[model samples]
Target: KPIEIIGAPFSKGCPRGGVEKGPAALRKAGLVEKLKETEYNVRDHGDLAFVDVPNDSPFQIVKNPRSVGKANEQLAAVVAETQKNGTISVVLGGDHSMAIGSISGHARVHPDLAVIWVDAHTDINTPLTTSSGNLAGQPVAFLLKELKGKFPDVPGFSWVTPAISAKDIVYIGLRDVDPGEHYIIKTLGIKYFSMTEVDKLGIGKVMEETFSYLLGRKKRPIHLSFDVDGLDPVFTPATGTPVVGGLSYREGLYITEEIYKTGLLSGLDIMEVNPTLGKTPEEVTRTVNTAVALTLSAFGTKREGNHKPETDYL
Candidate 1:
């Protein structure tokens, strides 16, 4: 199948500025060319232009509700269109908040979609429960069917509805969850493997169980929402909300490599890589390089070298 690349140069979801440059940084690191090296017909849809909503006030504690909501609404349409074209939608995000649209749009086309959210935080806090009020951390709340009526209407979120069930989602690499988020996860019985679990069960077992739990009974499309902060700060320091003791370089790559092995990835989001957060140019380059590597792994780049068959070599 062909691969469609959509860039989202937005960052209102969090209290950060440089995250909006994530897509451009990834492209500069050669994300498209690297994918083409893997022999896929890749199409770059370029970046989406988000409108600056005037007088966009916070809805209850949720910050930038209008800007975030409107941007996601537009993203949903584009993602759905890519899905309709029968191509995998690989979305380069401005922040984790973009998941609200990427997953919602994918679910619209494939209602039975299963999500693999790999991040340091769950991003599940409701508007009422959020302390930071950043929409980036509250995206999961907007997407889960179980949290349908838990939140009041936000200013720019009228176009969004719950897109996935709690059971169809699985979270990995969590270590910085909020108190309210923890309560919601347990209350809703969401399947998750925190850093503690990653240390105990190992990434291989964690992934084995992840697929077993999510795709055990039925086969369906997979949406991979990856946040750069999910990796250890040593590798991805150029991101907002960096957490300590996150996944190692090999562990992070292993997750995406395994996901590619499944051949079920329908949509992907590489989010939260802020070039400006880095203190030096080296840090920014490291983060961008890691993002490109992760994207390649998801699309079938193997660490063990790649080779085409003799028929194709001619």
Candidate 2:
């Protein structure tokens, strides 16, 4: 299927500005050409306008409530339309918060959507529970139908109906989760693998268990929501959050390869990239290239000489 490229250039969902420039950065870095080289039928949807929510939107700690919701509303619609056309949607995110829209769009089409969230934080805080009050930290709560009633009124969010169930989601690479997010994970019994488990079980086994836990037999359409911060700061330093001891580069690509082998991938969101966060242009280039590489890996790119018998002599 031709991939639908939806560029979400929104940053209001988090406390960053250049992240809204992620789509442009990737685009300028030859994202389209790279995909074409891989023979993907790339349909570039360009980028969305940057959203700016008013300060007087009547918020209870969740920052940029109205603008974020409004932007996501548009994103959801675009994503839904893309899905309806029977193409895999590849959303270049402005931040993790855009998952609310991206996932919602996928859910609208495939109500039985399964999610693989790769991030350092659980992103499940409700408005009242979040100490940082960042909407980026709270999208998971908004996405799940069970937690919908707990959220306060945001005028623009009236259009967004909850689209995910706790049972349909899983998490990987969590290490900096907040207390509220931890409580929610425990109470909801969501399947999650922190770096601790990744270390104990190995990335291969971690993914094996993740797949087994989420899609043991039935194959639901999968939505892979990946945060760049899920990688170690050394590998992906141009992100909003840089947690130490995160997934190694090899492990990150391995996850992508395994997911691609599932043949159940429906959508992808490579998120939390802030090109402006880097200390040097080279640093920014490195992060942007890594993001693009990760996306390509998930789609179809493979390591050199990966195919073939280990030893032809044998």
Candidate 3:
């Protein structure tokens, strides 16, 4: 299948300015060319234009409700169209908040979609439970069917329907979950592999369990919402929220490689790569390059080698 790239240069989800540059940075790092090397016909859809909503104040501690909501609304439409066209939708994020639209749009096309949220934090806090009030930290609250009536009515969110059920989602690399998010995870029985679990079981075994848990009963399209912060700050220092003791470089790539092997990846979002947040140019380069590598790995770039006819030296 052909791959379609959608650049979402949005930044209102958090208190950062540079995260909006995430999409461009990934492209400038030669993401498209690298993917082409993997033998997939890649289409760059360019970036989506997100307009500022008028008087878009905080709605009960939720920042930029209208702007974030509207941007995600637009993303949802575009993602749905790409899915309808039978191409894998690759969403380059403005922030983790973009998952709201990416997953919602995917669910529109594949109502039986299963979500794999790879992040350091669960991002499941409702408006009432959020301390920072960044929509990036609360996108999951807006998408789960179990939390439908549990949250207040925020402006610009009427278009969003609770997309997936609790059992349809799985989380990995969770080490910074909030109190409310922890409660939600426990209460809803959402399957998750925290950093502790990662340490105990290893990435290989974790991926095995992830597939079994999400695909055990039946097969369904997978939407992988990957936040770069899931990796340790040493590797992805340019992200908005850098966490320590996260996935190793090999572990990160391994997750994507396994997902690619499953052949069920219908939609993907690489979120929160804030280039401007890097203190030096080298840091920025490393971060963007890592993001590109992860994306390629997800699209079938094996670490050992890809011995297609065009690349065969022997």
State each model's CA lDDT, in order.
Answer: 0.94, 0.86, 0.92
Per-model TM-score on C-alpha atoms: 0.98, 0.94, 0.98
Error of 1 at 210 (Å): 0.3
* Steric clash pairs (candidate 1): none
Steric clash pairs (candidate 2): none
lDDT of 3 by residue, 1-314 (tens): 98999999988999878899999899998898888888678898999999999999889899999999999999999999999999999999888889999999999999999999989999999989999999999989999999999978988899999999999999999999888889999999999999999999999999999999989999989999999999998999999889889998899999999999999999999999998999899999989988898999999889998777766586
What would the TM-score be for candidate 2 when compared with the true structure? 0.94
Task: TM-score for candidate 3, please give it.
Answer: 0.98
Model 1 misplaced stretches (Cα beyond 4 Å): 311-314
Model 1 / residue 197 / CA error / Å: 0.6
- lDDT score of residue 222 within candidate 2: 92
Clashes of each: 0, 0, 0
Candidate 2 runs further than 4 Å off: 50-58, 305-314
lDDT of 1 by residue, 111-224 (tens): 999999999999999999999899999999999999998979898889998999899999999999999999999999999999999999999999999999999999899999
lDDT per residue for candidate 2 within 1-314, as digits (tens), equals 68888898878777667888888888899988888766468888878774565563548677788888888888898999999999989999788889989999889999998999999989998888988777888889889988978867665678878898898898999999887788899998898999999999999999999889889978789999999999998888888889999999899999998998888889999998898898888888988888898998887888862433465755
